[PDB]
């Protein structure tokens, strides 16, 4: 029942995408590692509740690696939002609910603010607003050093579930290993300053639902909680840390379904 295919957009990207289901559109934007197999279980669970679910690998990452250098260097939320709109145009997805974590969170907030006619509602998770020198400094290391360091960071610091993270399996981890240097050189120095949360009044009254991982250390996304509360944006928790779609796929799928259903009711 799942489409697994490629589609090229006029900006030069050849995307790998997956799609399952019929009904209102839900789009699952990856985190910075750009790997959509992390959504595999949840895509089926969400689609089974009466939705068309689309996901894709991000430009320069995994099976979307055929893309111009501009799309994976000096990456900002606004650049990513432009690219996501390009694939939604190519797939004739006019109105979408969107999810994203980390750089994907920045992307979906930029999508909602910049393309209000295209986005029904956005779910943002763990939106990075601060530069972290220990991550930025990986960009000048050799590729294999980057991959070794960031594979360890993902498993031990932010996966939210080491067994589930490892159970993604060798094929996924081999694609992540190749993505780490692309992410390191393109994302950590330029994503946080691009965060679309400087203007709290621009967030007020928008169809935005914000989450942070329940187990994430308080210091990581303290600023998200403050910002969301100042803007009156609905803010809450999901189990685990940065990858609830990996660590807790059934809870993640339920959250996406219930939040989409809440906005379909409010839309009427």
Q: Does 220 bind ligand 36J (CB under 6 A)?
A: yes
Number of amino acids touching its own copies (CB under 8 A): 17
Partner from its own copies, K ion, ligand 36J, none binding residue 250, C-beta < 5-8 Å depending on class: K ion
CA–CA separation, 166 and 183 (whole Å): 20
Stretch that binds ligand 36J, among 37-45, 87-95, 174-182, 183-191 (CB under 6 A): 183-191
Stretch that binds ligand 36J, among 26-34, 82-90, 167-175, 232-240 (CB under 6 A): 26-34
Number of amino acids touching ligand 36J (CB under 6 A): 15
Q: Does 60 bind ligand 36J (CB under 6 A)?
A: no
Q: Does 179 bind ligand 36J (CB under 6 A)?
A: no
Q: Does 187 bind ligand 36J (CB under 6 A)?
A: yes
List beta partners, residue 125.
101, 211
Neighbours of 126 (CB within 10 A): 25
Neighbours of 220 (CB within 10 A): 18
Q: Does 161 bind ligand 36J (CB under 6 A)?
A: no
**In this complex, which beta carbon is closest to ligand 36J, that of residue 47 or of residue 122?**
122
Q: Does 132 bind its own copies (CB under 8 A)?
A: no
3-class SS of residue 259: helix
Closest by alpha carbon to 132, among 201, 85, 192?
192
Stretch that binds its own copies, among 49-57, 84-92, 143-151, 211-219 (CB under 8 A): 211-219
Q: Does 204 bind its own copies (CB under 8 A)?
A: no
Tell me how far CA of residue 5 lies from CA of 17, 29, 79, 242, in angstroms: 6, 16, 23, 27
Burial degree of 247 (CB within 10 A; 0-12, 13-18, 19+): buried
3-class SS of residue 25: strand
3-class SS of residue 158: helix
Q: Does 141 bind its own copies (CB under 8 A)?
A: no
3-class SS of residue 4: strand
Q: Does 235 bind its own copies (CB under 8 A)?
A: yes
**In this complex, which beta carbon is closest to ligand 36J, that of residue 146 or of residue 158?**
158
201 contacts 230 by C-beta, under 8 angstroms: no
**Residue written as token pair 């990858």:** 243
The site for its own copies (CB under 8 A) is made up of: 212-222, 225-226, 229-230, 235, 237
The site for ligand 36J (CB under 6 A) is made up of: 31-33, 102-103, 126, 128, 135, 158, 187-188, 191-192, 220, 242
């Amino acid at each position: 029942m799942r489409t697994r295919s490629t589609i090229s957009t006029p900006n030069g990207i050849t995307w790998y995408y997956e799609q399952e289901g019929t009904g209102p559109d839900i789009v699952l934007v990856p985190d910075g590692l750009g790997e959509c197999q992390m959504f595999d279980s949840s895509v089926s669970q969400i689609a089974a509740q009466g939705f068309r679910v689309t996901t894709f690998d991000m430009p320069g990452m995994s099976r979307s690696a055929k893309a111009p250098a501009e799309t994976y260097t000096e990456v900002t939320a606004q650049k990513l939002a432009s690219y996501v709109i390009s694939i939604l145009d190519a797939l004739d997805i006019k109105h979408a609910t969107v999810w994203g974590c980390s750089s994907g969170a920045s992307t979906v907030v930029a999508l909602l603010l910049g393309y209000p006619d295209r986005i029904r509602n956005a779910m943002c998770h763990e939106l990075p607003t601060k530069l972290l020198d220990h991550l930025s400094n990986t960009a000048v290391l050799e590729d294999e050093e980057i991959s070794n360091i960031l594979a360890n960071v993902m498993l031990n610091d932010v996966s939210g579930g080491s067994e589930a993270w490892q159970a993604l399996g060798v094929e996924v981890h081999a694609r992540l290993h190749k993505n780490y240097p692309v992410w390191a050189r393109g994302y950590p120095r330029t994503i946080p300053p691009s965060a679309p949360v400087q203007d709290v009044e621009a967030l007020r009254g928008k169809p935005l639902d914000w989450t942070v991982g329940a187990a994430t250390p308080t210091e990581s996304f303290f600023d998200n909680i403050v910002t969301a509360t100042k803007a009156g944006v609905n803010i809450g928790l999901l189990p685990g840390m940065a990858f609830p779609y990996v660590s807790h796929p059934d809870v993640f799928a339920k959250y996406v379904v219930e939040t989409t259903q809440k906005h379909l009711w409010n839309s009427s």
